[PDB]
Design an enzyme around this catalytic site. Structure first.
Site, PDB file in Angstrom:
ATOM      1  N   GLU A 179       0.799  -1.206   0.000  1.00 58.72           N
ATOM      2  CA  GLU A 179       0.000   0.000   0.000  1.00 58.72           C
ATOM      3  C   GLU A 179       0.839   1.267   0.000  1.00 58.72           C
ATOM      4  OE1 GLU A 179      -3.068   0.465  -0.603  1.00 58.72           O
ATOM      5  OE2 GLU A 179      -3.976  -1.509  -0.250  1.00 58.72           O
TER       6      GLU A 179
ATOM      7  N   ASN B 294      -7.619   9.805  -5.680  1.00 60.51           N
ATOM      8  CA  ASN B 294      -8.380   9.026  -6.647  1.00 60.51           C
ATOM      9  C   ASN B 294      -9.303  10.024  -7.336  1.00 60.51           C
ATOM     10  OD1 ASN B 294      -7.513   6.272  -5.550  1.00 60.51           O
ATOM     11  ND2 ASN B 294      -8.589   7.102  -3.746  1.00 60.51           N
TER      12      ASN B 294
ATOM     13  N   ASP C 129     -13.288   9.259  -8.149  1.00 62.88           N
ATOM     14  CA  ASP C 129     -14.385   9.402  -7.190  1.00 62.88           C
ATOM     15  C   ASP C 129     -14.188  10.510  -6.154  1.00 62.88           C
ATOM     16  OD1 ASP C 129     -12.503   8.254  -5.447  1.00 62.88           O
ATOM     17  OD2 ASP C 129     -13.920   6.837  -4.594  1.00 62.88           O
TER      18      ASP C 129
ATOM     19  N   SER D 293     -11.894  10.867  -3.815  1.00 62.42           N
ATOM     20  CA  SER D 293     -11.482  10.451  -2.484  1.00 62.42           C
ATOM     21  C   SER D 293      -9.958  10.362  -2.421  1.00 62.42           C
ATOM     22  CB  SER D 293     -12.107   9.101  -2.129  1.00 62.42           C
ATOM     23  OG  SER D 293     -11.512   8.054  -2.871  1.00 62.42           O
TER      24      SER D 293
ATOM     25  N   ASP E 288      -6.538   8.353  -0.344  1.00 61.03           N
ATOM     26  CA  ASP E 288      -6.032   7.270   0.500  1.00 61.03           C
ATOM     27  C   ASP E 288      -4.913   7.876   1.349  1.00 61.03           C
ATOM     28  OD1 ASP E 288      -7.640   5.211  -0.664  1.00 61.03           O
ATOM     29  OD2 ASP E 288      -6.278   5.134  -2.373  1.00 61.03           O
TER      30      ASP E 288
ATOM     31  N   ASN F 293      -9.017   4.956   3.104  1.00 55.50           N
ATOM     32  CA  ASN F 293      -9.843   5.863   2.300  1.00 55.50           C
ATOM     33  C   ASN F 293     -10.746   6.859   3.041  1.00 55.50           C
ATOM     34  OD1 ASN F 293     -12.343   6.323   0.164  1.00 55.50           O
ATOM     35  ND2 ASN F 293     -10.391   6.098  -0.911  1.00 55.50           N
TER      36      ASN F 293
END
Ligand code: NA
Length: 130
Positions: free
Chosen positions: A35, A46, A49, A51, A53, A60
């Site tokens: 990750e 991202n 959408d 959002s 991380d 998220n």
């Protein structure tokens, strides 16, 4: 900060992650590795959408933490996403524990399925004294 492999393994062990909700410590290590590369300041936007991380586990903003700019988001961890960018991983660990208390468990992270599930993950904790 960028954790050394064994340094992180001993830290997660101390925070009670080994076997949490049936998830072995080597799985958490495999997850953190893929990750973020063990980087607590890692952020990934991202655009698809709206959002983001956050942190070592790449948690998220749509469901787990609040950053104010993610549409129709919730804050299940009851944490500002800023908390997931500290060098001290205590909050990130407490939130990761919350994520896995949901039905999917460790499967919530797609990267875990791609690079950790059904693989020999022993390598991540070898020689660390955990
Ligand atoms: Na949120």
């Amino acid at each position: 900060k960028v954790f050394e492999r064994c340094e992180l393994a001993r830290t997660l062990k101390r925070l009670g992650m080994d076997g949490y909700r049936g998830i072995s410590l080597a799985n958490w290590m495999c997850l953190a590795k893929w990750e973020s590369g063990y980087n607590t300041r890692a952020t990934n936007y991202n655009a698809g959408d709206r959002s983001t991380d956050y942190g070592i586990f790449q948690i998220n903003s749509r469901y787990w933490c609040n950053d104010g700019k993610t549409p129709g988001a919730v804050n299940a961890c009851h944490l500002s996403c800023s908390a997931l960018l500290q060098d001290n991983v205590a909050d990130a660990v407490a939130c990761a524990k919350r994520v896995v208390r949901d039905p999917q468990g460790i499967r919530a992270w797609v990267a875990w399925r791609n690079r950790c599930q059904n693989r020999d993950v022993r390598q991540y904790v070898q020689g660390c004294g955990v």
